[PDB]
Amino acid sequence: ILKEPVHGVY
Amino acid sequence: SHSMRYFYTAVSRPGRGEPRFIAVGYVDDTQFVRFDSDAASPRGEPRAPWVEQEGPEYWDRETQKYKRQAQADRVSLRNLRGYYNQSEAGSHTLQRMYGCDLGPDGRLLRGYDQSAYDGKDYIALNEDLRSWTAADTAAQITQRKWEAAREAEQWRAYLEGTCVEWLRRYLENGKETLQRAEHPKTHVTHHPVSDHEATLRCWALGFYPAEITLTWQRDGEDQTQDTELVETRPAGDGTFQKWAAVVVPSGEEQRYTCHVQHEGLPEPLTLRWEP
C-alpha cells in the first residue's frame, strides 16, 4: 500500500 | 531477495493545465498497481491478480492517498520552480522512488526514499532512515522543511514497518507466481555475415526475475570486449528476455561457449552452437 501523503511538500 | 517499490512521476504542463501525476507499484519485477491523474475518474487500479480481490475499502483508501499525493505534488512543483527561478512556460518533472528490501532470511534489510528534479538527484533519505542527503542548495530548503516536521521518523516507521508487513502479504497472496523463479530457456543461433564470419547469438527467454548474467567465452577466456550484449527486455507476459552475440570466423564456432547464471538455475549453464 501507499505511504500516507502526510509527509510535506517539497 | 524481495522488494516492494513505488515510483511517482509528476510532470508540470506549461502555463495552464495542472500537472500529470502517475504512480506505479512493484513487488520485485511484477507491477501490481497504477494511478494516473489524467483518467476520467482516476483511482488506484490493480495490475496483478493477487491484489484484485482486496476489497473496495482497500482500493478507496489507496485512491484517496493517491489523490492527496497528486495535490501535494502540484504545490511541490511550484515550490521547485521557485527554488530554481524557473518560469511557468516550461514543463518540469518531479520523480520519487521509495520502498523496502527483504534479505535472504525473509526479513527487513533496508528502506529507501529518493527524489529527482528534471532527471537529476534532488534529495535522498540516508540508509539509516534518520536524515537526508541534499544534492544542492534548493534541496537543502526541502531538507530543512522536512526536518521541521521531523518527517524522517514517519518515513522510517513506514519503510521498516508498513512496507515490510504489506510486502509479505503481497508475497503470500501471490506465492504461486511471485515466489517461483522461471529459469531462462536458452539456445544458440548461427547467422552468417559472409562465408568467413558468423554471428553467434546466445538467447535467454521466458525468465523471471529480470536479473541474469549472459557471457560469451572463447577457449574459456571472457570475450566482454567483442560481445554485443542487449539490454534485458520485457516479453510482455511477466517474463524477460536477453541475448548476447559475438562474431566468429567460420570453422571456429566450437571454441565459443555461452554462460548463463540465473536464480532459477541451480548452477550456471553452459551451451554452444549445435548445428
Binding site: - | 510532470v11 502517475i22 506505479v24 518533472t93 520523480q95 547469438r201 527486455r233 520485457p234 516479453a235
Partner: protein
C-alpha cells in the same frame, strides 16, 4: 534539464513462426523527459490498436515503456517501431528482425 534520447528494441514475445499469432514489442528505455510518441508500423503503416505499459523508470531516473500489439507474422510482411522524442530531430525507426 537532462535530455536522454530513447533506446529502442523491437522484438516478438515468442520466437516468430509464420502464421502463428504472437506479440510484437517495442521497448523504449533510457529517455528523459517522459513525453514520447511511439507507433508500431506494418509495411510502413501505423498499427491502430497498440497498447502500452504504465510509465515507470529505472534507478538512474530514466523512463521506460513497452508498446505491444497482437500480430501474426508472415514471410513477406515487414514491421517496425517508430519513436519521436524532444531529443530527436526526426522520428527514429527500428525495423523488426526476427533473429534479434
Amino acid at each position: 534539464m537532462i535530455q536522454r534520447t530513447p533506446k529502442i528494441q523491437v522484438y516478438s514475445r515468442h520466437p516468430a513462426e509464420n502464421g502463428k499469432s504472437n506479440f510484437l514489442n517495442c521497448y523504449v528505455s533510457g529517455f528523459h523527459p517522459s513525453d514520447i510518441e511511439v507507433d508500431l508500423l506494418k509495411n510502413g503503416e501505423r498499427i491502430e490498436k497498440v497498447e502500452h505499459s504504465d510509465l515507470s523508470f529505472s534507478k538512474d531516473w530514466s523512463f521506460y515503456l513497452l508498446y505491444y500489439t497482437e500480430f501474426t507474422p508472415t514471410e513477406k510482411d515487414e514491421y517496425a517501431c517508430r519513436v519521436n522524442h524532444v531529443t530527436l530531430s526526426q522520428p527514429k525507426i527500428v525495423k523488426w528482425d526476427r533473429d534479434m
